[PDB]
Coordinates of C-alpha atoms in Angstrom, one line a residue:
Chain B
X734 CA -31.2 81.1 -29.2
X735 CA -29.1 82.5 -32.0
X736 CA -26.6 79.9 -32.6
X737 CA -29.1 77.2 -33.5
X738 CA -31.9 78.8 -35.4
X739 CA -29.4 80.6 -37.7
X740 CA -27.1 78.0 -38.2
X741 CA -27.8 74.2 -38.2
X742 CA -25.5 73.4 -35.1
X743 CA -22.5 73.8 -38.1
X744 CA -19.3 75.3 -37.3
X745 CA -18.3 77.7 -40.3
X746 CA -21.8 79.1 -40.0
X747 CA -20.8 80.1 -36.3
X748 CA -17.6 81.3 -37.1
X749 CA -19.3 83.6 -40.1
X750 CA -22.1 84.6 -37.8
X751 CA -19.2 85.4 -35.0
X752 CA -18.6 88.4 -38.0
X753 CA -21.7 90.5 -37.2
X754 CA -20.9 91.4 -33.3
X755 CA -24.0 91.9 -31.2
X756 CA -26.9 91.6 -33.3
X757 CA -27.8 88.7 -30.5
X758 CA -27.3 90.9 -27.2
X759 CA -29.2 93.5 -28.4
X760 CA -31.9 90.5 -29.4
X761 CA -31.6 88.4 -26.3
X762 CA -32.1 91.3 -23.7
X763 CA -35.2 92.4 -24.9
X764 CA -37.2 89.4 -24.5
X765 CA -35.9 88.8 -21.0
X766 CA -37.0 92.2 -20.1
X767 CA -40.5 91.4 -22.0
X768 CA -40.4 88.3 -19.8
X769 CA -39.4 90.4 -16.1
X770 CA -42.1 92.7 -17.4
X771 CA -44.8 90.2 -17.8
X772 CA -44.0 88.3 -14.6
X773 CA -44.7 92.1 -12.8
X774 CA -47.8 92.3 -14.0
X775 CA -49.7 90.0 -12.7
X776 CA -47.8 90.7 -9.6
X777 CA -49.2 94.2 -9.4
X778 CA -52.6 93.3 -10.4
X779 CA -53.2 90.9 -7.9
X780 CA -50.9 91.1 -4.9
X781 CA -52.7 94.4 -3.1
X782 CA -53.3 93.0 0.0
Chain E
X295 CA -18.6 81.3 -17.7
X296 CA -21.2 84.1 -16.3
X297 CA -18.2 86.9 -16.0
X298 CA -17.0 86.0 -19.6
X299 CA -20.8 86.3 -21.0
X300 CA -21.2 89.5 -19.5
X301 CA -17.8 91.3 -20.1
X302 CA -17.1 91.9 -16.0
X303 CA -15.1 90.9 -13.3
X304 CA -18.4 91.4 -10.9
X305 CA -21.8 89.8 -10.9
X306 CA -24.4 90.8 -8.6
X307 CA -27.0 88.4 -7.0
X308 CA -30.0 87.1 -9.7
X309 CA -30.2 84.4 -12.2
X310 CA -28.8 84.8 -15.5
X311 CA -28.3 82.8 -18.8
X312 CA -25.0 81.8 -20.2
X313 CA -24.1 79.7 -23.1
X314 CA -26.4 77.0 -24.8
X315 CA -26.5 73.4 -24.1
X316 CA -26.1 71.0 -26.5
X317 CA -25.1 66.6 -26.4
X318 CA -22.1 65.5 -29.0
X319 CA -23.4 63.0 -31.4
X320 CA -20.6 60.0 -31.5
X321 CA -19.9 57.2 -34.1
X322 CA -21.2 57.6 -38.2
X323 CA -23.3 56.0 -40.6
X324 CA -22.5 55.7 -44.3
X325 CA -24.8 54.0 -47.1
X326 CA -23.9 53.3 -50.3
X327 CA -25.6 54.0 -53.6
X328 CA -28.3 51.5 -53.6
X329 CA -27.0 49.1 -56.7
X330 CA -25.9 45.7 -56.1
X331 CA -25.9 44.3 -59.8
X332 CA -21.7 43.5 -60.4
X333 CA -20.3 44.3 -63.5
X334 CA -19.1 41.5 -65.6
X335 CA -15.4 42.0 -66.3
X336 CA -14.9 38.2 -66.2
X337 CA -15.8 37.8 -70.1
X338 CA -13.4 40.6 -71.2
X339 CA -10.5 39.8 -69.1
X340 CA -10.5 35.9 -69.4
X341 CA -12.0 35.3 -72.8
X342 CA -10.9 31.9 -75.3

């Protein structure tokens, strides 16, 4: 989560972070893709019957 | 909220991840600097 890690649950910090744009929508998608891939790997290896 | 965080009016089936979850703290506690000895202003103000 960007909001808590970069900013200590502040408000002006959140407003300043809002200026950078989509530097988290890019980050929050790669991890979800990795998680989906990891969940698919074990299903591919074992589910063969 | 799911539509808002996806910038679209149509959402397909699945599980998504919306905004974070937090609990708002209430009230406040203020602590004075730990000094208690009183300044003796009685002598200067009241002297014989």
